[PDB]
Symmetry: C2
Subunit: 146 residues, 2 copies
């Protein structure tokens, strides 16, 4: 109950951080998002969000509501691929889970994903917000392998 | 010694956050900064950094090495003013202190400044990094009145 308490504490602190980082990404592209005319500014917003980091493993991705990747900071070759049916190594439907978390839930999802600093799968806590004008489920995450 | 310990803990956690937020701002403008030709991209970088927030009180400012404000997210009327000699209510030379922290020190400075959510002075912990190509001391901060 005691070492479990310290873990919940660490998790909750990370969830607060994730909400802040998400706010930074959303507000960084706000001038573009607000002034957009039929997707005119999406490319410019992608270039900003794909450059942003809060640490080496701290980056943005986005998917549309059909699970098609619209931007990926780490692996831009995912862009335009439909990953709706994608499962992690534990059978978590990652993309569908993030789309649903962001639209119908609290934004959070536990899953495993490539971790940049070790180039291998690791457990992650993702956080996503839905940007309806562009149909982007914009997400980031913290790795919990610690 | 005990309630003092908990305060140092809270401070250190905030310093870690500040370094992350600063990284986000610096990386958000990296495409522009890297491709800049004689200040061509400064205006576009200003527009991004002035929109960013990590909370209502969480924003960017920048000054050049002479103490002239180059961007201010909250009070853009400061832009172009020389605030090198500015002192807070406790006589802290805020602008000179941030310029020196960012160039010769650890980036951090305690001072009081307008706090957006109460529209009044409050104690703050600022954090600044020097962007030499543009001579910008780019900074943000967390309020410590809690």
């Amino acid at each position: 109950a005691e070492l479990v308490r310290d873990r919940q504490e660490l998790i909750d602190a990370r969830k607060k951080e994730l909400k802040a980082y998400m706010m930074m990404g959303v507000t960084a592209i706000k001038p573009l998002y607000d002034s957009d005319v039929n997707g005119s500014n999406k490319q410019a917003a992608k270039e900003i969000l794909k450059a942003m980091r809060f640490e080496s493993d701290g980056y943005f991705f986005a998917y549309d509501s059909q699970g098609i990747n619209t931007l990926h900071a780490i692996k831009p070759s995912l862009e335009g691929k439909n990953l709706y049916d994608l499962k992690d190594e534990n059978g978590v439907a990652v993309i569908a889970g993030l789309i649903d978390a962001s639209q119908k839930g609290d934004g959070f999802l536990y899953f495993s994903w490539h971790k940049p600093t070790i180039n291998a799968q690791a457990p992650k806590l993702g956080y996503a917000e839905y940007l309806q004008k562009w149909d982007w489920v914009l997400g980031t995450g913290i790795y919990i392998d610690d």
